[PDB]
Amino acid sequence: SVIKSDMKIKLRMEGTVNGHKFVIEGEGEGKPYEGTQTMNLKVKEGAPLPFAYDILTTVFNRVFTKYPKHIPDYFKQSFPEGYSWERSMTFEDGGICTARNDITLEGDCFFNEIRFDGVNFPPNGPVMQKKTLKWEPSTEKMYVRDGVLTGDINMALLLEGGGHYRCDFKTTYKAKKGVQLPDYHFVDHCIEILSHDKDYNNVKLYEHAVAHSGLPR
Amino acid sequence: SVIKSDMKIKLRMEGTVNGHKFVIEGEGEGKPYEGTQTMNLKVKEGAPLPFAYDILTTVFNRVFTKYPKHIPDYFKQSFPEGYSWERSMTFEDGGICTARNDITLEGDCFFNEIRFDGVNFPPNGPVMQKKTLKWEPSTEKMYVRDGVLTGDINMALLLEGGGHYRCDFKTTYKAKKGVQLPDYHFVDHCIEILSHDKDYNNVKLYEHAVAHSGLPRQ
Amino acid sequence: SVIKSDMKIKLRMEGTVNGHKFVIEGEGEGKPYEGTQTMNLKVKEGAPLPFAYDILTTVFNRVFTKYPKHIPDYFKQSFPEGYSWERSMTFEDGGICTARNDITLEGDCFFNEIRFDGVNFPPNGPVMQKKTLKWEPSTEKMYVRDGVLTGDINMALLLEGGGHYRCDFKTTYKAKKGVQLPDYHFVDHCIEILSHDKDYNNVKLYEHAVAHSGLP
Amino acid sequence: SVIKSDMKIKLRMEGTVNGHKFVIEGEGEGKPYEGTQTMNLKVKEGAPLPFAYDILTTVFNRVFTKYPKHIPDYFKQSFPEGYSWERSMTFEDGGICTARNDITLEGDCFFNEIRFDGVNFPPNGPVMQKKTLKWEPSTEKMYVRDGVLTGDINMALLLEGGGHYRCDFKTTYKAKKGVQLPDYHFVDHCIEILSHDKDYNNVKLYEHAVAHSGLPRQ
C-alpha cells in the first residue's frame, strides 16, 4: 500500500569474485503486483569484469512477485520498514558465492545495499571462461524454518556449446517487523539480460516472478 | 502407441533402511496421457516398518506425466523397450537413500523391479521416529547430460508440529533405445497417500504429474 | 578378550552399480592390535565388473585398527556381540554409493554380510571408464553423535593421467551392546590392491589403520 | 630464504555475518619452519560481535607449517612475490562462509588483506547463540586440481552440551609466480584461543601445523 502499481529501484553492489573487486550501480523500475521489473546496470569499478556477468543477475527483490490472494505476501507486507535477505549459491564445480541485500523504501523507490563474494571458481570453468548464455527459468520452494522465510532453488545456466551448469540457491528472507508468514509455496522465475555491451559495462536486465501453490491433487 | 489411455502397474520393491530389511508389492492403474496413477501397496516382509513410509512413495514412473506436444516425452518414446532410472535422495540431516527401478511393459502392464537402500538416518530424526505427514508438491528440473535425462528436485516432507524436512533428489533416466531428447523443462508433481492402515502395511497411493516449460518472459 | 593377535575374515558382498548386479566373496586374515589385514576376493556373479573395483575396496572392519590405550576402542569392545556399520560415499561428480556391513564373530573368524549400491555414475566418468589407480591415504574424523559413533573422511582416487577424483564418506558404526564412547579422534588409513587379474575377478587387498588424537 | 626463522604478522579483516558488519585488526609473530604462530586480535568496528568468534579464527597463512624436505612447500616457495587463498566453509546446518586472504611480505612482516562473509546461520544455531568451545584438531587433504593447489578439511566445533558442529572447508591457494607443485599430502592443524575478554573484542590466538605424507604403503 506504500507499495504502488509502479515503483522505482536504485542499487549499489560491491563485491569480489576470485579476488577481483568491483562496484555496479543500478537504476530501474517495476510493477510489484505484476511481478515484473527492468533495470539498467553500470560497472563503476573493476571493468572489464573477468567472470560471467550471469552469476550477478539474480542478486540485482521478491517485492516484484505476483502473489495470489490466498498466499501471504511476506515481501509486500514487510514495507514500509523493509527486509533483508542473505543467499548462498553453491555451483556444481565448487564455486561458492555469498550475497546479501538490505532493502529500504524512500518515497516510491527501493534502495538496495548489496554485497557479493565468489570463491573457488575453477580457472577453466564456465564462470571464469565466460561460457554462460542465460539462467533457465526456475521454481523456488518457499518455506518457514525457525520463523525465517527460506527459499531453495535448483538453478541452471545454459552454456555455449549446449549443456547446463547447475547451481543450488538457498536464500533467507527477514522482515524488519512482524508479518503474516506464508505456508509452503512456490515462486516461478524468468530472468533475462535484454541487452548489454561487449564487456557488460552496461546491461539492461528483466525479471518476471509469480507465486503459486503447485499442482493440485 | 503401445502406451494406451489406461494402463496397469505391477511392482516389487526390496530394500533396507538403517539395516531394516523389507519387501513391498504393489498393483495399480493409471492414465499415462493425464499424468495420474493410483496403486495399492502391501508390505510382504519386514512389517511393521520401523521408519517413515513417506521416504518410499516417490520410488513407487514418469510415463505417468502429462507431456505437452512441444516437449519431447522421453518416457513414452522409450516403450516398448522401456527404461530404467536411478536416484539419490540426500536428506538435510545426513540420511542418504539410493533407489532404482527397471521398468518393462508386457501387454497393458508396466512391471517395476525396484531396489531401495537408506543409510545414516539419525535414530531420533523424523524418518526413524515416523514424524512425517506428506511430501509437499514439487517441481523437478529436467535436463540432458551425457546423452540421458537428469531430474533434480528440492523435495520437502511436512512434519508433525508444522516444520519441513528437506531432501534433494537427483534422478538419472535411461531409455533402452534412442529417443528425441528434450530441452531443459519442468515436471510438477503432487503425491498423496490416499489411505493407509495404522502401520502402513496397506497403503493406497496417488500421483499427478504435468510437464511444462516454466514461466515465460510475458 | 575374544579379539586375538591373529584372526580370520570371511565376507560376502552383494550389490548393484549403475544397474549391474554382482556378488563377491572374500577370505583373509589380519592382526587387530597391529591394525593390518589382507583379503583374497573372488567375483562370484556379475563378472566382468563394468566399473572401477576401487569403489568397493573400503567396504571390504575398524577392528583392524591400532588403538592407543588413551582412546577407547569402540570396535574391539563391541565383541563378542559384534557391530554393524552403514556408509554413504558422495563422489564429486554425483555418483552416490550406500554400503553396509553386519559383522559377527564365530570362533577366531569375523563374518561380514555386505550390501553395496551405486547410482548416478556418469557414463564417461572415471568409475564407469575404470580410470582409477588407487585411494590416497586418508585421515578419518571419529566423533559420537546420537550416542552413535560417526566417521567422516575426505577420500580421493588417483586417476590415470594424474588428477584426483574426490569422494566424501560418512560412516555410522553401531555396537550391538553398550560400549565405552571415545572422544573426538582420528584414524589414519592406507588401503592397497596388492595384486589382481585382468578384470579384477581375483583381488588381493591390504589395509593398515592407526588411531590417534592429532597434533598436540 | 626471505622466509626467516622468526617473522611478524599484521592483518585486517573486514566482513559481514548475518548482516552484521565488522573490522578486526591483528598483530602477531611466528616460526615458519616450526609451523607455529601467535596473534593478538582486536575488534575495531562492530563490537560486540553477535556470533561465535571461532568461525573467524582459521581465517586469521600456510607459510606457518612445518614442511618436511620430501614435500615441496608451495607456501614458502611463493615468497617474496607471495600468494592468495580463497575458502568456502560449508556448515552442516546451512551456514556458509566465504573468505579470502591476499598475503604480502614487507621486510620480516607478512601483511594479510582479509574479507569474510557469512550467510544463512540459523538464529538459534550454535554460531548465532555463541555455543562453540573450540575447533578440534584436523587433517587437511592437499592436492592439485587443474593447476590450483586445493585443501579439503572435515572440521568440527566442539559444542556446549558435548556434541560437535561439522564444517567442510575447501581452500584454493594461488602463488603470484610459478612454484614447484607438491603431490597429494596432508597438513595436521591445531588452533586454539589462548585467552579472550568477555565479548571477544580482544583475543590471543595460536596455531600449530605440520605437513606429512600419511600412513606409508606396503
Author numbering:
A (entry chain A): 4 to 63, 65 to 221
B (entry chain B), D (entry chain D): 4 to 63, 65 to 222
C (entry chain C): 4 to 63, 65 to 220
From the study:
A notable reverse single-site mutant (LEA-A69T) involves modifying Ala69 back to Thr69, which ALL-GFP and ALL-Q62H both possess. The A69T mutation has been documented to cause large pK a changes, which is clearly the case for LEA-A69T (pK a = 8.4) versus LEA (pK a = 6.3). Interestingly, LEA-A69T is not photoswitchable under 505 nm illumination (blue), which is considered to be a marker for a primed-convertible FP. LEA-A69T crystallized in space group P212121 with a full tetramer in the asymmetric unit, while LEA-H62X crystallized in I222 with a single protomer per asymmetric unit; both crystal forms were described previously for LEA. In contrast, with a slightly twisted P-ring conformation, LEA-A69T displays the lowest FQY of 0.73 upon 490 nm excitation. The lack of photoswitching in LEA-A69T is likely influenced by the π-stacked His193 that helps to maintain bright fluorescence of the anionic green chromophore. In LEA-A69T, His193 is slightly shifted horizontally resulting in a larger angle between the two rings yet maintaining a closer ring-to-ring distance of 3.7 Å. In particular, Thr69 causes Arg66 to reorient and H-bond to the bulkier Thr69 in LEA-A69T and ALL-Q62H, instead of the I-ring C=O group in LEA and LEA-H62X via the reoriented Arg66 without an H-bond to the smaller Ala69. In contrast, the distances within the internal charge network change drastically in LEA-A69T due to the Thr69-induced changes, wherein the distances between Glu144 and Arg66 increases from 4.4 to 6.2 Å (due to the reoriented Arg66) and the distance between Glu211 and His193 increases from 2.6–2.7 Å to 3.3 Å, while the Arg66 to Glu211 distance shrinks from 4.4–4.6 Å to 2.8 Å. Such a shortened distance between Arg66 and the catalytic base Glu211 (highly conserved among LEA FPs) and the resultant disruption to the internal charge network may underlie the significantly hindered photoconversion of LEA-A69T; however, more rationales need to be developed for the further reduction of photoconversion efficiency in LEA-H62X.
